[PDB]
Amino acid sequence: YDPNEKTFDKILVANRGEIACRVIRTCKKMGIKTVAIHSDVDASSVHVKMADEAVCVGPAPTSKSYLNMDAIMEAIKKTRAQAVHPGYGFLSENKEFARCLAAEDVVFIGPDTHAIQAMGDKIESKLLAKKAEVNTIPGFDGVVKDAEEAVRIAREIGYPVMIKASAGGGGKGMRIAWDDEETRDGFRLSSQEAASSFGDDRLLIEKFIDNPRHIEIQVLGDKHGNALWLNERECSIQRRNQKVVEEAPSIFLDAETRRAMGEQAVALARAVKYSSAGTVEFLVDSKKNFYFLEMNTRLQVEHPVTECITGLDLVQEMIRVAKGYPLRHKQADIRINGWAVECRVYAEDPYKSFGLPSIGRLSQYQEPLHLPGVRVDSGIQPGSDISIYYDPMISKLITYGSDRTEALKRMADALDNYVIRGVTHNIALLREVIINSRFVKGDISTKFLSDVYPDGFKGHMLTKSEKNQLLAIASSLFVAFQLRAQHFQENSRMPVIKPDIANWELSVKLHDKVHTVVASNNGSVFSVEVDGSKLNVTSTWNLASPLLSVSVDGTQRTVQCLSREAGGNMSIQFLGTVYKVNILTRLAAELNKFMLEKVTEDTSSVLRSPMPGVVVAVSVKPGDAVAEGQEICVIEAMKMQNSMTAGKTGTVKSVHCQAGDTVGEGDLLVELE
Amino acid sequence: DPSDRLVPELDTIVPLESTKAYNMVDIIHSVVDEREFFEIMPNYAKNIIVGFARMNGRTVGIVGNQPKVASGCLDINSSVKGARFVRFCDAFNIPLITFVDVPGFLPGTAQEYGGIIRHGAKLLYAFAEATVPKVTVITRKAYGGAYYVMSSKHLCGDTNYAWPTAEIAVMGAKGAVEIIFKGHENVEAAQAEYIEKFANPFPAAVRGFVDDIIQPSSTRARICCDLDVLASKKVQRPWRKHANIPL
Amino acid sequence: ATSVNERIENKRRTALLGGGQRRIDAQHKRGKLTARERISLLLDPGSFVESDMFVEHRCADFGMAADKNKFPGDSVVTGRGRINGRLVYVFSQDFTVFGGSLSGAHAQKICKIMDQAITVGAPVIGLNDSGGARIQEGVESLAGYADIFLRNVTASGVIPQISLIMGPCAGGAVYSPALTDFTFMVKDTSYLFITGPDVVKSVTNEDVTQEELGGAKTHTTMSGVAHRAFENDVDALCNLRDFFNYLPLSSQDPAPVRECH
C-alpha cells in the first residue's frame, strides 16, 4: 500500500453491492478519488455513501440503469474520471463498452478486448485450448446442427454426453443426456431454449465428467507478458451450477497437480495475452485428470478467499497493472499460508428448491466482525431491502486459520453469530454443509447437495443429547421470562409479594412429541430435568440481546429467539436451524387437553376496495395463480395508491374491475379461488 | 434493552414519493422495547393503530396512522377507536406516543351523514384533554385539520419531532396554488416556488411548531429520554364535576 | 392639525362597514345580516362592549401586505354584553372580509374573549360564518384553529358554550361547533361539511350540492350534529335569547330560579 507511486486520481466503479464496496475500500487504501454509480432505488446504498461522490444513472431496472452505456459515458465525462472498474458481471464482458471507452483517454481496468471476444464463446475457447496443448474434455469440434449429427457424434464421444449452449452462462443452457433418443430430444430442447434465452443457437456437445471436483486457478497477468498462478481454489459445492461454499486450499489436489495446473494456466494465459486478473476452471476427476472448462475474463467472485492464503490485494494489483507497472512478485514468492473457507449468504429459502430468491426489508442486520479470523464482504446495511431487480445475495463470509478444522470451527461460530431479520436466508444450509461428516472428511463432488439431501433440504436432524440441550435451553428461557415478568418497581401503597415457587413443571411440545421438564432456578443456574436426564444451564440471561450465549453441561451454545407469544409458542434458532417449541405448564397442558381443534378454512376469495376511487392499474387476470403478499389491484385514491394483496395462495377466479375504473367503498373487484 | 439503542433501519423506511405506502407497525416494532407490542383492535378500523408497549420498562400507549390501509385517512371508526384508548391511557397515568402520517379526513356523503364531525371532535377532544406526557413524531404528512387532531403542540403537546420526510401543509400544494394564484393561473412556476418553501417541515419549525427535525435512527433514543423527564409532569385545570364529551 | 384623531375616526368607520359596501349589499341580497346587525339583535340594546376593534392581521405573503388587503377588525367582531341582564361573551364572524376565513388575528380575538369568559365565569355564544382558513398565511392559520379548539376542551363543563351556524362553514371550522354544548343552524343559508362538493366529486365521484351535503335539514334530521334549525336570522336570534334564559352562567352557579305565577 505504498502511496508514493503515481496512480489514477479518479476511478469510477461500474457495479453495485459488495464488489463496489470492496473496490471503494481498496481505492481509499491507496489514495484514489472514487466515483460510484447508482440507480434511483440504490441512492442510499453502502457503496454510494462510502464513495467520495456518486452519479445517478437511471431508473430501478438494471437493463436501464447499470447496463446503459451512454449514462456511464456521460458520468465519466462530467466527473473527469481517469479509470473504470467493472467489478464482475454487467459490462465487464461488453465489447461495445470497451471500444466506446477506449475511444477516449480513459482506460478499462481489465483484460484486452481480444481475450474477451476469444473467451466469450465456448467453441472458440475449446479450440484455442486445443491449440494451447492443454488437457480438455474429449468432445465434438464445431457446432452440431441436426439431431442426427448429435446422435452420431454421441455414438463415439461417450454415453454420458453433456450438451451446452454456446456463449451465455449463469448455469443455464447445460444439460446431461444418456441415450441417443435423449441425445436428440435434449438437442432440440436446447435449441429452442438457447434461442429464447441466449439467442446464439450454437450448441457445444462434449463428454460429461462423472463426479468431478470444480477446481479453479487464479492467474494475474500483466502488460509485460508475465503470468502468475495464485495457488488454487475449490468450488465443488454448487446449486443449479452456481457455487455457494468454497475452499481455497484443495485437499484432494496435491503439489505436483498444483504445479502442473498452474503451468498449464500460465501457458494458456500467455497464449491469449491476458494482461489482468482472471481464473481458469478445471474439472478434476478421481484419477487427478483435469480438463479446461472456462477461463473467466474478469475479477472472479470467489477472489477474497485466496487472498487469505496469499496476502495479495487482487484489486490493487489489477489497478497497478492497468497503470502499466511490472508485477512486483515472482512465482516463487507465491505460497500457501494457513487455510481459508468461505460461504456466500443469499436471500433465499434453502428449504425450497435448495434456495429460491425472496424479497423483503432487513429490519435487523449484524455481522460477527468481533469473532476471530472472520472477514465479511457486504453491500448490506440495516434497512436495505432485497428487490427483484438484482442478485438476491446478502453477503460473503470468509474464515481463515492455521488448518482446515480451525477454519471450519470459526465458520460455524460466525454463522451462529450472524443476525439477519427481515428476509429468509440460507444460513442453515451453509452450517450443515460445513459441519457435515463427508465435507470434513474430504469426499466432495459437484453432486454434494443433491446426493447428501436427495429428498430436499429438511433441517438439522438433532440427536438425543442435542434434543435434551435444546429442551433445557427453551425451558430455562421460559422460566427466565416468567421471573423477569415478576419484577416490578416498589409501589409503597400495595407491596408486591413475589411467589416462592421453587420447581416449574412444564410441558414442551417439539415437532410432534411432548416432553415433561422440571426446572429449578438458583441465581443464574437452571437445573433442568428432561425425561430424567439432568442438565445445568448458565448464562447472563439477557432477554433483549438478539444473540444469547448459554453453557449447557460445559458446552457453550449460541441461540437466538426470533419469536415468542404469551400462548407458549416460541421460535428459537439453535445450531443454525429454527425450531418451534410450545411450552406450557402442567396444569395448562391438562386443561388444554380438553380444548377442541379449530378448523381454519376461511374464504380469502373476495376483494374489497378500501374507499371509492379510481383503480390505477390491474396486474392480474382471471386464471392467475398468486400467493400471499402479491399485489392484486392497485387502487389510486386521493393522491395515494394502495397495492391491495391476496389473503391466501389461490388462482384468480375473476377480475371484475379493470384499469381506469371508478368504484365505491366495498365493491366487487376480485374473486379468488 | 438499552434506552440509547439506535434504529438505522428506520432511516429509509419512508418511500421517496408520497404515492407509495409503508407499514407503521414496522416503525413501532423498531422503536419499542424488545419489539414487543400489544395491539388493541388490530382488525377493526385498520387505518389507525393503537396499542400498549414499553419504553425503558415503563408502560406506554402507542397511537399512529397506517398508510397501508385507507391511505392513513381518518374516518368515524378510526376516530372512535383512538379516542377511547387515549382517554383510558390518560385516566390511568400512561404516557402517549403518536406517529403522524395522515393526508386528511375521508370525504363523501357517507361520512357526513354518519356524523364525521362528532367523531373527529371525539378524537380531538381526547387528545386535548390528556394530562399525561405525550410525544409526537411526524413521519411524512400532516395536512388540514388532521394535523392538529393528531396531537399537535397546540393541544398542550410536550415534545414534537419531524422526520426529514415530513410534509406539514394547510392543504395540498396544488389546490393551495390554484386557490392562492387563481388569477395568476401559472402553476408552472407557482407550484415550483410553492413546493420549494412549503413542501418541507421548515415552516412549522421556524414558527416553533416542532421542537427539532431529528434523524429517524435516533427516534427511540430521543423518546425514552423525554419519557424520563416528563415523568413528573403536573398540570392544573379549572374545577368541574365532569366535562361534556361530544359523544 | 393632528392626523391621529382623523386616522382613528377613519379606522372606526372602516371597521363598522367591514370589508366594503357592495359586499354588504351582496350579503343582504342573499338574505343574510351582517355580523354587527346580528350582535345588535342578540344583545340587550346599548349593552355591547366591543374588544380588539383595531386588531389587524400580520401576514405579509402573496400580496397581503398591501393596504387593499388590510381591514380593521379582521373579519370578526368580539366583545361582551348582556341578555336579560345576565353577562355573556360573544363573537360574530364577518363573511365580508376575505370570506370570514380565519387568521392569526381572528383566532387571537376569539381566544382572548374565551379566556375572559372562563376567567369571570360567563357563557360564550359564537355566530359562525366563515368560508374557511386564510391559506396565504399558511400553517399559522391551523395553529389558530387548534388554539381555539384547546380552549373549548378546557371550557367544557365549566361555562356553557353555544354555537349558531349562520353561513357556510368548511374545513377545520366545523369542530368548534362540535366541541360546544349546543349547536343551532339557520335553514337554507347555513352549511357544515369538512369537504366541499367539488372535492367529493373529485374523490368519491358523486355529484351533490351544498344543501344536501351540509345543509340544516341534513344536520338536523339525519346527522345528529345540530340541535335545532330556524327559518331566518331574526327568528334564530330571538330563539337563542329564549334558550339562553334557561342556562346558568357557570357550573358553580345553581340552576336559575325565576318568579312563577
Ligand SMILES: CCC(=O)SCCNC(=O)CCNC(=O)[C@H](O)C(C)(C)COP(=O)(O)OP(=O)(O)OC[C@H]1O[C@@H](n2cnc3c(N)ncnc32)[C@H](O)[C@@H]1OP(=O)(O)O
Ligand atoms: C385540491 C382542490 C381544492 O383546492 S378544493 C378545497 C380548497 N379549495 C376551496 O376553494 C375551499 C374554499 N372555497 C369555498 O368555497 C368554501 O369551502 C365554502 C365554505 C364552500 C364557501 O362557500 P361560498 O359561500 O360559496 O363562497 P364563494 O365561493 O362564493 O366565495 C366567497 C368568498 O369567500 C372566500 N373564501 C371562502 N373560503 C376561503 C378560504 N378558505 N380562504 C380564503 N378565502 C375564502 C373566497 O375568497 C371568496 O372571496 P370573494 O368574495 O369571491 O372575493
Ligand SMILES: Nc1ncnc2c1ncn2[C@@H]1O[C@H](COP(=O)(O)OP(=O)(O)OP(=O)(O)O)[C@@H](O)[C@H]1O
Ligand atoms: N463437461 C462437463 N462435465 C461435467 N460437468 C460439467 C461440464 N461442464 C460444466 N459442468 C458443470 O457445470 C457447472 C457450471 O458450468 P460452467 O462454468 O460452464 O457454467 P457458467 O454458467 O457458464 O459459469 P460461469 O459463471 O463460471 O461463467 C460446473 O461447475 C460443473 O459442475
Ligand SMILES: *C(=O)CCCC[C@@H]1SC[C@@H]2NC(=O)N[C@@H]21
Ligand atoms: C388531497 O387531495 C386531500 C384532499 C382531501 C381534503 C382534506 S380533507 C380534510 C381537510 N379539510 C380540507 O378542507 N382539506 C383537507
Ligand SMILES: [Mg+2]
Ligand atoms: Mg462457467
